[PDB]
Design a protein around this ligand. Sequence first.
Ligand SMILES: CN1CCN(C(=O)C(C)(C)c2ccc(C(=O)Nc3cn4cc(-c5ccncc5)ccc4n3)cc2)CC1
Length: 335
Amino acid sequence: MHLICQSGDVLSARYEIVDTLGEGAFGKVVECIDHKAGGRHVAVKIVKNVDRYCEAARSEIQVLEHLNTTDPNSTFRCVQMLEWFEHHGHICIVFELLGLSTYDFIKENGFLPFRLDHIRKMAYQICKSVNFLHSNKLTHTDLKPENILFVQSDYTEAYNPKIKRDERTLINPDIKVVDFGSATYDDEHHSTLVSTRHYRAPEVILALGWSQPCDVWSIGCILIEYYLGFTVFPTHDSKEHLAMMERILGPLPKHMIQKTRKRKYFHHDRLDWDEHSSAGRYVSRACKPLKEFMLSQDVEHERLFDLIQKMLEYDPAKRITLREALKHPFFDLLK
Ligand SMILES: CN1CCN(C(=O)C(C)(C)c2ccc(C(=O)Nc3cn4cc(-c5ccncc5)ccc4n3)cc2)CC1
């Protein structure tokens, strides 16, 4: 991979790499000048030459052809694929060039949260985009701030020598959704593990089956993050994650606890969790009932938190849908 991305390299005798934009499990994404479209800059995703990532990338191309055909204007804000090719046996998918990921924008600002007026506009566009997937018998399964990109470099930035970095101020918060390598059709085989730990729904953790509602959970976690500047589930352990859920959202529904085949996590009908261990006191300390994360009691803030709370319903059958979410009072201001 290192051997076929470098600045100056030309892919498919037209795409000149000028920069690396990002990396994930799949491989890398680079910025290219397209010398055969008048020098337009594009994003090219170069996939690892590994079976599971090759298959995920053919899956992604297939989803993109479907979404881009269904929604040619990108009204529902799924990234447009321009084409795909093979480069030294790696699949390369060419995209319209977007701007920063919401992850990178927040991280590089020192994990400062987005303005509430921006979160409103971004939440709406994310729900509108993922609900278009939901309407078309798809679940994304891997919604996270890294997979939400600003459309434009509609921001300013100045070097602040006090904190020795650039601060980026957002002008227009318009986003698109990316990465359809995990996106699963209703009728296809559902992977057991989906989503990256922090944005994974309880039905996924407990292996109870999943579909569209697990996207809604993920979006709930994103909105939290946008508001605070960090996750409420900062963990790398499934049981601790569940312990964190219990502290933030209250006890798991007995019916999910009792139904799960992931019984290692439990003892009779409670999380097998030592609250009085130093790991348990860590969770109690770091985690609090959701509403206590609110930075203002202002109604606008209550409206967002009420949507977040419905998005983080434990029971996927009770969880708000995005169709419902798009009608929530938090978005009334947009209309
Ligand atoms: C590192 N430097 C940071 C500083 N820079 C910038 O502030 C500009 C505005 C010039 C810039 C920033 C980011 C991108 C970008 O990252 N754009 C992109 C990724 N990207 C990623 C998929 C994608 C993913 C995952 N799966 C499928 C597709 C799609 C489109 C796409 N566009 C562009 C310009 C220059 C770059």
